[PDB]
């Protein structure tokens, strides 16, 4: 409880974006890790602007396949979506 300046936000986010990784790319989920590089992982612009086109959908956002190379780890990733998700 009190005593941390730690909170939950981009974790949720990250664990979602891992198991969409793991699908695209064909791989497991553990071999994804938080500061992992999507490049090294296999993504490009193809298989990265359908991953986005998930991410657009589920977090209410307008963003395009070049984010991957401005947050190409997933620690970046998931608080750029937990930063810019609608509240609901």
Avoid: M, W
């Avoid at 986005?52 to 997933?74: C, M, R, W």
Wanted: glycine share 10%; charged share 20%; aromatic share 6%.
């Amino acid at each position: 409880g009190p005593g941390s300046a730690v909170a939950v936000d981009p974790a949720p986010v990250a664990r979602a974006l891992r198991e969409e990784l793991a699908r695209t790319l064909y791989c497991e989920p553990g071999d994804i890790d938080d500061e992992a590089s999507f490049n090294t992982l296999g993504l490009d612009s193809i298989l990265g602007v359908e991953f986005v086109a998930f991410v657009n959908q589920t977090y209410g956002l307008d963003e395009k396949a070049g984010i991957l190379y401005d947050h190409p780890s997933l620690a970046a990733l998931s608080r750029h979506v937990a930063g810019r998700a609608a509240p609901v």
